[PDB]
Design brief:
2 copies of one chain form a homodimer. The first copy, chain A, is α+β, with helices and mostly antiparallel strands and about 300 residues long. The first copy, chain A, has one domain. Helices cover about 35% and strands about 25% of the residues of chain A. Chain A is built from 10 helices and 14 strands. In chain A, strand 1, helix 6 and strand 2 form a beta-alpha-beta unit. In chain A, helix 2 packs across helix 5. The radius of gyration of chain A is 20 Å and the shape is globular. The termini of chain A are far apart. Chains A and B meet through strand 3 and strand 4 of A and strand 3 and strand 4 of B. The PDB classes it as hydrolase inhibitor. Keywords: CRISPR-Cas, AcrVA2, Cpf1, Cas12a, MbCpf1, MbCas12a, MbCprf1, anti-CRISPR, Acr, hydrolase inhibitor. The assembly is dimeric. The entry is titled "Crystal structure of AcrVA2". Chains A, B: AcrVA2.
């Protein structure tokens, strides 16, 4: 079957007929500017379509839900349509991804493989509120952004929640990274959004660490393999985009190992992230600590 | 209007006709044993009703959902009906209660005023899963329990989620306090349940700290007042139970200042948070609320 994300993206592309032209504009901007991490800034989305810019210029247009939905979606799909990476977390790893080492640097989240990735965490049974209603979080997109605040561009990681519903709120939730501070400092000093983000970072960390457990159709994908540069027509400048999503498993091998322990039935000590230091010119390391089997 | 918790409790008391007798048995047990914190242990609920005990003895009775629900509800309501304390958190404070310090002792959660309290956190917009469905957490009960694990008694705080739904899962989620350890240790080191509980602890802390903001119908209720001994008919041994809930506000005064600052702004507000610290040998703990401040 077609993934519900792809079906909703296609339906949006039909219902907003200018979407493909907007994606073409975004590509042009990216080729012009060549940003270090993002594909196209959320800030520039109003400029992409003149009718949307006009409606957005009306009083209350900057707080309209439908218009921000379309703009957020243009930003999201414009970055994501170039790779269509879907990463499904193994349930045994879901139940063990709970937190990050509190001293974790924001810089580590600059290590994502693409401009935008989709992460499937449905087994985590996390919910949220598109206000007025509680909904199951099927997954989320992580997508880079460039935000100019008081004269300076800032590296931001935006999170877009996917509840697989018609009225899904696609508005991104930002998480600043352009500082030498830690996750706790950005998140915990400076909140609904922050709480949500703080829950999603342990899952996203798999696409940032040096030693992940990523497989494609059962074959291991190394970190070098994941980062291996993709090949934009060099004589035409056009973008080539996938016709189907690329669906990976994260932590399947690990899960498989855990599933063997449970089959035996004397106890399992679950895995977790583990992080530490490396006085001056210090460094960070985070590695997964696998579940171990005792007695 | 009648609070939904009370309506569901009455409907349960009607649908399970032996409930009141079971509550009387619990009272007798309490008077015999006089535990330090709990009213009646979850462990003894199968013994309360013979038909339920018989169905519980069947293969798969132990894991049956309906039975477990009845037992859970007897345990919950038997303690809670003696006080009917409902504590509603103020919107401005709910929003600033996010976590505790990891160092926070488990012992501090022995400071609750009743055997069982209900906390209304509707505005926190927290959700959960009665499996297959996502639901809004309207509130939760915190209720003490006493559990023998491997031959020894243990002090436990149980959490019961309230989603205000017919098929609500009333099964308690335990949290051990007998250790002398900290929240982070008991929880994180040792999880779905643990995660939920971790989220709930910041709200429950208001009923444990030395300087809370609790008001009843606009009147301050001090910690000494809250903790004052209640009056069991001394000649008869009967329990007297409230006919209506006692509804308190937590953080209403605090919220009012915060509202005030917003009014002026309509300059910034630094939000409040819990703040904790130490007090080398024979050390002690302190937690206090840090209020929101107005800047510029």
């Amino acid at each position: 079957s077609m993934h519900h994300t792809i079906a909703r993206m296609n339906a949006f592309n039909k219902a907003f007929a200018n979407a493909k032209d907007c994606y073409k504009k975004m590509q042009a901007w990216h080729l012009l500017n060549k940003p270090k991490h993002a594909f196209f800034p959320m800030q520039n989305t109003p400029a992409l379509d003149n009718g949307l810019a006009a409606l957005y210029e009306l009083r209350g247009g900057k707080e309209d839900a439908h218009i921000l939905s379309i703009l957020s979606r243009l930003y999201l799909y414009g970055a994501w349509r170039n790779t269509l990476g879907i990463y499904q977390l193994d349930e045994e790893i879901i139940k063990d991804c709970k937190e990050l080492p509190d001293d974790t640097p924001t810089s580590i989240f600059l290590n994502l493989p693409d401009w935008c990735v989709y992460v499937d965490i449905s087994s985590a049974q996390i919910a949220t509120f598109d206000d007025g209603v509680a909904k199951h979080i099927k997954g989320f997109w992580a997508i880079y952004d460039i935000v100019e605040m008081n004269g300076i561009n800032h590296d931001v990681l935006d999170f877009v929640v996917d509840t697989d519903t018609d009225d899904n709120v696609y508005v991104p939730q930002p998480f600043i990274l352009s500082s030498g501070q830690s996750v706790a400092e950005v998140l915990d000093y400076g909140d609904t959004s922050n709480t949500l983000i703080k829950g999603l970072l342990p899952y996203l960390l798999w696409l940032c660490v040096a030693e992940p457990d990523i497989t494609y159709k059962g074959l291991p994908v190394s970190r070098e393999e994941l980062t291996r540069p993709k090949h934009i027509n060099k004589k035409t400048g056009a973008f080539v985009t996938p016709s189907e999503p690329f669906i990976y498993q994260i932590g399947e091998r690990l899960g498989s190992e855990v599933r063997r322990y449970q089959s035996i039935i004397p106890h399992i000590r679950r895995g977790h992230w583990h992080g530490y230091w490396q006085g001056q010119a210090k460094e960070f390391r985070v590695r997964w600590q696998p579940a171990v089997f005792v007695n």
